Amino acid sequence: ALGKLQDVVNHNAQALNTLVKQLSSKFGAISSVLNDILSRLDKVEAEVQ
Amino acid sequence: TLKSFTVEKGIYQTSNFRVQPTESIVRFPNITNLCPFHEVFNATTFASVYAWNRKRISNCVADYSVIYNFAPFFAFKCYGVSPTKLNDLCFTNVYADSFVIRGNEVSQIAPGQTGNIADYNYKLPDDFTGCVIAWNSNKLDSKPSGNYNYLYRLLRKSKLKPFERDISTEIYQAGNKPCNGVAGPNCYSPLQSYGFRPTYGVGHQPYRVVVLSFELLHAPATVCGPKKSTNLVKNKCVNFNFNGLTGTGVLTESNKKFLPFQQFGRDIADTTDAVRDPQTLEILDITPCSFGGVSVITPGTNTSNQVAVLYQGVNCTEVPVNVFQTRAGCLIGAEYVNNSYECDIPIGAGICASYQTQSQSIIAYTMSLGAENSVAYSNNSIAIPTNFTISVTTEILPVSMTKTSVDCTMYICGD
């Protein structure tokens, strides 16, 4: 019977979960970790990534 | 604009109008010297890697096409400016460097580069503009016994800043024991010769490198390119060129008080507002030329092929890119009558237009809110109805819309 307030809770949980999961993407770069980009490349290529 | 052959009654925004500039204005400071590039590129021996020279170049016209006739170089590699368009803009400081390096460290001269020359001998800044003339020197920097006239340093205790020198020679120590000027245990002199020989590989041949550096227009200009100046005219939509910046606007006189070290004036959107003439000490404002939007007012194509044009938000004494000035610009093609009807086509602040017979024509009018009524009020008078009517009224409300679905893999990619 109380599905509306549960949906209000679940939507705001799921949006923050998706925002956390979006950090794992590469977006066309060579690595999803910023430190490995900074340590594995020169200035220009790491600046592009 | 509507992608159709029949339009309906209404007002449609079609395009925009821009007042075109007529003349071209070129302004440059007056200099007659030529920058002596011929005296730098040819020498018996260049400076060392650690003792590279600096030449201050200013107040001269520099023709950069003569650099191709002084050296047979392969790569004219540049970063912040293209090599074919140095004759148009102007600068404020030009540098010059000269050193001779090995063939395996030619690519070490780069912004954001590390290594041996780029870390301890010759470091360029990350925001470097201007570029480098580099060519092979196996003809003049080679001996059968070897060339020992050039020195390089192996390493030092820390990193080295861009545009920094190191002339003094000290014995390096990597321990607690003192060297005391004698290259003993953990004591080595950091200077050794290149030893240029023709019996080595293709990657170790000597090279001649000349580096030029530019400074952007953050100051009054001294160095310019070969470009004829132009007389100054004002109060007219022109194409000015003030010391290498292009633009379009109406140059006027100014009442702004400028400090003696000031020559520019910027906006919030980083757009030039005022400018200083390089010839005379006068400050000119920059205001862009007139523009706006164009709205076409028509009835349907089944009724007429006549239109009326509204140029939005302009005082239209400057209209050539029935003329009646409204608050929303001015209206061309429709005449203003001293009547008041219902609003057919809305134009602007209280003005509407329609298609009436007084021969058919498009007219503009001030819209009427309603019929004037004055109900008789009295303190001992009432009005009571004696009959009635029954009325049926239709009200329409949307409820749902079209449900759609998408497939990303077939929309973006398509199997």
Place this chain on the structure above:
Amino acid sequence: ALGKLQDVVNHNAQALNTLVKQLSSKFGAISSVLNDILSRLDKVEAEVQIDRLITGRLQSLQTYVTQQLIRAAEIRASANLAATKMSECVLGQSKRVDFCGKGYHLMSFPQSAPHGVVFLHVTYVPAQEKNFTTAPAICHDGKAHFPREGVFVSNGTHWFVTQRNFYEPQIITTDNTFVSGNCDVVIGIVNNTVYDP
């Protein structure tokens, strides 16, 4: 008359039309056709062009979904209003002014329409007014008589009591009047007689 449902149809047609038409743009690549890029180039350069195409088509799809969400919010607000009007006009009688039609609301009849609903609002409209002279009370034997429901009106010689929304004049009687006070406090009280049955 039915421009709102027609606009509802036209917006959903136009959004899909421009979403299909956005597949012809190059978005900085060499071609808008993926097979031409895949056949005309090696792996790395085609990967660059496919990255540009993917970015452009993802941006267009996100714009479409955001516009559809805003339009769905507006449509849901209109559907809530239509459900309230179905509950309050059809299923009862509404006292709210200019709700359920202009006038005094009597009935309503739902009618189905494409992507919507149509209400036929039956209302009562008074037609033929007539001037009368009126008074707030009637002074009779030192007493102030106020009407229980209605209004005192006069045609010039006789005073009657009648209802507010129709002219049904009746003789002033103690059955349709009540008394509270005397004739020294009401402003505008007039002199007449009150019939006792």
Place this chain on the structure above:
Amino acid sequence: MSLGAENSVAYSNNSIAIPTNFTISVTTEILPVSMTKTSVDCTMYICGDSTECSNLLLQYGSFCTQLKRALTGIAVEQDKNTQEVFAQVKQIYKTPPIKYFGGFNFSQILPDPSKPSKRSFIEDLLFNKVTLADAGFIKQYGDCLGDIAARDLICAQKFNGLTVLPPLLTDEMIAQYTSALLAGTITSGWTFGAGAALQIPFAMQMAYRFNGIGVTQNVLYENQKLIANQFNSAIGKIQDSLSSTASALGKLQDVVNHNAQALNTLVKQLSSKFGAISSVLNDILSRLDKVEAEVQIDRLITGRLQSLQTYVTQQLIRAAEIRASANLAATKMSECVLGQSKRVDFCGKGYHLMSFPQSAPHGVVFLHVTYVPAQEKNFTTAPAICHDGKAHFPREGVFVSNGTHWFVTQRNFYEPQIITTDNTFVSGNCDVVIGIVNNTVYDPLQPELDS
């Protein structure tokens, strides 16, 4: 934080509290109706009379067509909101030249014909309270041409392809609509909202309003001077509250502030580099060759396109919010001004009698006249009265006792009367009602028959 004072009402099963006086209160509700209409040119904003930038901008398809369509839909919707709120009357009703409405003083909401713009005193105060941003409803290119002091914010806003369209209805027409609604409400009551305007004296109309909320009409005819004095004092208090505090109009000022701030951010975003080597487009054109400047211009085009899309999206969401507020304001105009509302806390706080609209910048202001009970007293009450083996219930009202005698009185005002068969009805015997008391019931026929 404190939720409020602690109260303990004395509930009992034979105790009632009935007010003996009242007070007339005029409140104030402020609602936004419409916001600023804007139109943005893409080619002047992103590129700015650069042909190469336009050529690379044409490769992104039809983004700018749908941004232009969205802004046009917002600009049409704003005029629709103002039309559906204010243009509800069919004729421009005129107030009579006399100034007697039963003692009620309406001279500070009726218009003043001495000034050119026919606006009232409260309308002038509400227009002076909100500081206008000097928008594009007046053309300003002649002022932007003549450079006085420094560069204005509005000139630098308009120089980058941002245009503000004037509203269709001027403030004179909004004030004329408000004057027509006020004249119709004062003269004809609620009769002008359901057909023709039927005139009625204002005291009798106010007695109809009192009869609507459950108070008999002789209360007004006995307390007309007191109620008129209370209304005039409430109107003067409204004037003092609007002259003293300027923070009551925060919603319209919030609308103005957001409409200025969005355009300020849109202008400020033109100075960013977005990864390019420079933000000025002419420097990139005059410094580099074709391909590398095409790369830099591509970066600038993508950044400015993203900023313009963000501006259009937040304008769409704000337009939806303003449209919901305008629907509420239209409902309040149709139900408070054009009638009398029985809905609780709609149309003010209390028992609703009248309402008077006033025009404001980007909105409307309502003056809700209400009825508030003032001075209560304790009484002993009963559900029914037993008499001759019959239970008597009141027709309209409540049985009260002052300690020795039983009376019948109405609900919202203490006007006790003798318990009589005229104001009571009989239903059943006395064995079914819990709490029935013993008293006599007067018969008017008995002394008339014996005389």
